[PDB]
């Protein structure tokens, strides 16, 4: 368990930061989905402003 | 011209009851009855509830 | 001077045999039933939604 | 002279379909609207009602 | 008839017997490794695999 | 004529999106 | 001649993923068709 702890502290901190990087990725993927909400909206409405 | 009798139907708006989200709640009560540590029964009660 | 595309099977197309690796998957076969297995009475009726237009015209 | 090719090649592909022993194919059965076909059925009633 | 107007759509007919698509399929592989009649290991591996 | 008074209701029945209900009800009315 | 009934293109995704909301869209275009 003392030998294990020398990798386990890195495995814990890497799997923490890889979860935390997936968590900053998931908030930023919902920002890509907001910017897709604006893209489907400008596609629908601003195209019909050009028809207007 | 008394149309809206057709009305190219109305094969419908179909808010029909064809749902399973309505979720299929798989309550799997895996009752592992052990004696002394040996499995004697596994009464795996699948309550297969469609909400 | 009209002539147009009188050729059948655009691009040479027909349903050529595919046959793959012999995958033995079980498939429990949750059917889409097809009430449009030639709903066809409806497409003879698409021709009669237009024979009704032919008689009125 | 209208020599124009009204037939476009509706491009099919079927590369050789490997061992799909990966079970992760969720079912979805989403169809059909097609409310434009019931608008066209209403335009056939309207075109008959004009022809009347 | 002037044939149309149309509602053919799947308003809750889609929303099908699709659960997510996923039956909340909580595959609890409770591996009860017993030796000599005693439990020596109880590895309860959850999968929540899509269905 | 009695021209294309198409009431297009986009009835999107949101129990999510790819599941699946883009009901573009074209009520092509002949007013 | 008559037309322009309001083509209300109320486009709405969501997209629940894995049992969690990962976006909640509810767009509101009215197309004057």
Can you spell out the DSSP letters for E18-39?
A: -SSSS----EEEEEEEEETTEE
Q: Do C30 and E3 count as a contact with CB atoms less than 8 A apart?
A: no
Of D7, G14, D13, the closest CA to residue F17 belongs to G14
Enter the tokens of residue C29. 């076969």
Query: Half-sphere exposure of residue G26, counting CA atoms within 13 Å on the CB side?
Result: 4
Residue in the structure block whose two tokens are 């079980």: C26
Q: Do D44 and E18 count as a contact with CB atoms less than 8 A apart?
A: no
Q: What residues of chain E, 1 to 51, have a C-beta less than 8 Å from chain B? A: 1-13, 15-20, 23-26, 28, 30, 32, 34, 37-40
Exp. method: cryo-EM
Start-to-end CA span in chain B (Å): 47
CA dihedral B40, B44, B45, B48 (to 10 degrees): -170
Of B22, B45, D22, the closest CA to residue E49 belongs to D22
Q: Do D49 and B8 count as a contact with CB atoms less than 8 A apart?
A: no
Q: What is the Cα F9 distance to its own chain's centre?
A: 3
Q: Please give the Cα distance from G14 to G22 (Å, whole number).
A: 8
Residue in the structure block whose two tokens are 């097609």: D34
Measured between alpha carbons, how far is residue A15 from residues A7, A18, E32 in Å? Answer: 12, 5, 28
CB G32 within 8 A of CB A51: no
Q: Which residues of G touch E22 (CB under 8 A)?
A: 18-19
Q: What is the resolution of this structure in A?
A: 7.2
Mutate to test the interface with D, among C4, C6, C29, C55 (most CBs of D within 10 A): C4
């Amino acid at each position: 368990a003392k030998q294990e702890s020398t990798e386990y502290r890195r495995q814990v901190q890497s799997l923490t930061c890889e979860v935390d990087a997936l968590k900053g990725t998931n908030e930023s993927l919902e920002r890509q989905m907001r910017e897709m909400e604006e893209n489907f909206a400008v596609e629908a409405a601003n195209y019909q402003d050009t028809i207007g | 011209p008394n149309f809206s009798s057709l009305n190219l139907r109305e094969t419908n708006l179909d808010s029909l009851p064809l749902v399973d989200t309505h979720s299929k709640r798989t309550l799997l009560i895996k009752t592992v009855e052990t004696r002394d540590g040996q499995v004697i029964n596994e009464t795996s009660q699948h309550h297969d509830d469609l909400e | 001077t009209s002539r147009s595309l009188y050729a059948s099977s655009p691009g040479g197309v027909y349903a050529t045999r595919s046959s793959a690796v012999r995958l033995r998957s079980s498939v429990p076969g949750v059917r889409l039933l097809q009430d449009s297995v030639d709903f066809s009475l409806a497409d003879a009726i698409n021709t009669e939604f237009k024979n009704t237009r032919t008689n009125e015209k």
